[PDB]
Amino acid sequence: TAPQDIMQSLQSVIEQLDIRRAQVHVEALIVEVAEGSNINFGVQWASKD
Amino acid sequence: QIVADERTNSVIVSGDPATRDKMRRLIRRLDSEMERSGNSQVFYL
Numbered sequence: 182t183a184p185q186d187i188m189q190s191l192q193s194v195i196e197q198l199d200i201r202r203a204q205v206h207v208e209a210l211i212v213e214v215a216e217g218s219n220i221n222f223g224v225q226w227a228s229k230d
Numbered sequence: 231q232i233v234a235d236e237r238t239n240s241v242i243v244s245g246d247p248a249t250r251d252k253m254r255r256l257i258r259r260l261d262s263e264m265e266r267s268g269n270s271q272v273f274y275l
Contacts, residue, residue, distance in 0.1 A: 185239045189264075190268040190270055191270075193266070193268065194270055
């Protein structure tokens with residue numbers, strides 16, 4: 182609700198803010214490659230006293 | 231003498247037929263349509 186002049190302004194704003202929105206599809210890719218190893222080798226003795 | 235009527239959006243004018251000529255020509259320019267550009271613009275960033 183406004184005077185005839187302000188209205189014609191607010192009609193060209195609303196006309197330009199009413200546009201159609203684009204939507205986005207966002208994929209993430211989480212990669213992980215792990216590789217372990219170990220090796221253990223040793224001799225032990227024991228005896229009497 | 232000029233008085234404005236809100237409802238019908240119209241201007242009441244008074245004077246002899248020569249004076250009511252000028253204000254009738256000057257009101258046709260002040261009623262001319264603005265081109266697309268008000269005091270408000272919309273900038274898409």
